[PDB]
């Protein structure tokens, strides 16, 4: 009954794209530092995830749009939306999460399908099946590079608990994350730097709460606002983190912004 959103951002301005799944359609709102506008993306789906990477100043976006029978990959490479090579069978209610790293890029896409999360990987030549296989109905992911080594954190929410699964190049292990919440989580994650710093937002029965990692234990963050559905993106300006959280209750999406000095309501509108 609430819309479902996905967001990505790039550069220091920043540029942002926010995708909203509402009543079977995914549409796009865009920011390049000078007002929100409606982007061209318009495709069927009940669930959306997104990742993006830069090649110099040129943005590349990958949108994973799930209907009741298929996930389709939609590619923006500066010159129109084109269907990509990624495909997966689904059933109604399936959820995805996507990350990418480098400029090749590498991509990992996680799908929660009938209570199981599985992983598909792009290495620059083809898609292959990843080792990840854990229970979950909802999923979010974030990733960070330490030199050339990718680190991945996946937040797997079953009916009862949210577990963090960590890839460090050698195998998947359970992470320190605890939700500080009861059963029924939907999550969104972002990360920055190489420690890393992680922020995980949980929507649970209409409330969003924040859990925080800066390298030395998980703690409850200042962010606390209503929402049935959450997404997030973040960007660095030198050493300073900026965060944009997209909180939705029904068809109303409110942006909340961290710029170093508390949460403020952002200029985002759905229009
Ligand atoms: C050799 C195998 N095939 C036939 C299956 C092939 C050949 C060339 C292209 C191919 C496919 O696909 C594309 C697709 C696009 N898109 C995105 C859908 C926008 C129109 C753009 C160009 C091509 C080109 C192309 C022709 C001439 C000059 C350049 C490029 C170019 O993409 O640049 C380098 C990367 O493509 C090289 C081909 O390598 C083998 C398979 N493959 C697919 C892609 C691009 O794949 C997309 O982006 C990936 C990151 C993933 O998200 C994929 O799922 C997605 O399909 N890169 N390699
Ligand atoms: C809620 C009431 N409490 C007691 C529980 C409280 C009060 C003050 C601080 C509190 C907590 O915590 C911090 C934490 C930091 N850290 C993390 C341990 C730095 C990495 C730093 C300062 C406080 C300060 C602090 C002291 C003096 C003056 C004001 C502030 C300040 O209000 O904090 C928020 C308002 O902004 C002040 C300047 O903030 C720039 C950097 N930064 C990071 C954070 C930590 O907040 C977490 O990370 C953010 C990125 C967001 O995700 C937050 O929602 C999240 O809580 N707070 N300040």
| Phi/psi of residue 8, nearest 5 degrees | -145, 155
Q: Resolution (in Å) of the shown entry?
A: 1.6
Collapsed DSSP state (helix, strand, coil) of residue 91: coil
Rg, Å, the chain Cα set:
17
Ligand 2 atom with the shortest distance to the CA of 263: 54
Integer Cα distance of 187 and 138 in angstroms? 7
Q: Please, is 78 exposed, middle or buried when counting C-beta atoms within 10 Å of its C-beta (0-12, 13-18, 19+)? A: exposed
- Yes or no: say if 81 and 75 are a contact pair by the CB < 8 Å rule: yes
What six digits make up the tokens of 22?
């509402």
What six digits make up the tokens of 71?
């996930």
CA of 126 to the centre of ligand 1 (A): 10
Q: State yes or no: 60 annotated in a binding site.
A: yes
Collapsed DSSP state (helix, strand, coil) of residue 191: strand
CA of 19 to the centre of ligand 2 (A): 30
Name the closest-CA residue to atom 20, ligand 1: 82
Length of the chain (residues): 271
CA of 124 to the centre of ligand 1 (A): 9
Q: Please give the sequence-ordered ranges of beta strands (E in DSSP) within 102-137, or none if there are none.
A: 106-113, 116-122, 127-135
What six digits make up the tokens of 173?
């292990």
- Yes or no: say if 107 and 51 are a contact pair by the CB < 8 Å rule: yes
Question: Is 29 touching ligand 2 by the criterion CB < 6 Å?
Answer: no
**Which of 152, 110, 149 has its CA nearest to residue 133?**
110
Q: What is the dihedral of CA 263, 265, 266, 270, to 10 degrees?
A: 140
Q: State yes or no: 188 annotated in a binding site.
A: no
Name the closest-CA residue to atom 43, ligand 2: 260
Q: How was this structure determined?
A: X-ray
CA of 234 to the centre of ligand 1 (A): 28
Q: Assign residue 68 a region: left if phi > 0, alpha if psi is -120 to 50, beta otherwise?
A: alpha
Coarse DSSP helix, strand, coil percentages of the chain, rounded to the nearest 5 percent:
0, 70, 30
**Which of 67, 60, 9, 77 has its CA nearest to residue 43?**
67
């Amino acid at each position: 009954s609430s819309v479902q959103t996905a967001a990505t951002s790039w550069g220091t301005v920043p540029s942002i794209a926010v995708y909203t799944a509402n009543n079977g359609k995914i549409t796009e709102r865009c920011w390049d530092g000078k007002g929100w506008y409606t982007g061209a993306f318009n495709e069927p789906g009940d669930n959306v995830s997104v990742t993006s990477w830069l090649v110099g100043s040129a943005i590349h976006i990958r949108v994973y749009a799930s209907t009741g029978t298929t996930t389709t990959e939609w590619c923006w490479d500066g010159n129109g939306w084109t269907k990509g090579a990624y495909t997966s069978s689904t059933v109604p209610g399936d959820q995805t999460a996507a990350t990418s790293w480098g400029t090749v890029p590498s991509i990992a896409v996680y799908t929660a399908n009938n209570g199981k999360i599985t992983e598909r990987c792009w290495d620059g030549k083809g898609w292959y099946t990843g080792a990840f296989n854990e229970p979950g109905d909802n999923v979010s992911v974030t990733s960070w590079l330490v030199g050339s080594a990718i680190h991945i954190a996946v937040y797997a929410s079953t009916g009862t608990t949210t577990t963090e699964w960590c890839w460090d190049g050698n195998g998947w292990t359970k992470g320190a994350y605890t939700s500080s919440t009861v059963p029924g989580d939907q999550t969104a994650a972002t990360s920055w730097g190489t420690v890393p710093s992680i922020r995980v937002y949980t929507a649970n029965n209409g409330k969003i709460t924040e859990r925080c990692w800066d390298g030395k234990g998980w703690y409850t963050g200042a962010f606390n606002e209503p929402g049935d559905n959450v997404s997030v993106t973040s960007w660095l300006v030198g050493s300073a983190i900026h965060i944009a959280v997209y909180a939705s209750t029904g068809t109303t999406t409110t942006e909340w912004c961290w710029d170093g000095n508390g949460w403020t309501k952002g200029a985002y509108t759905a229009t």
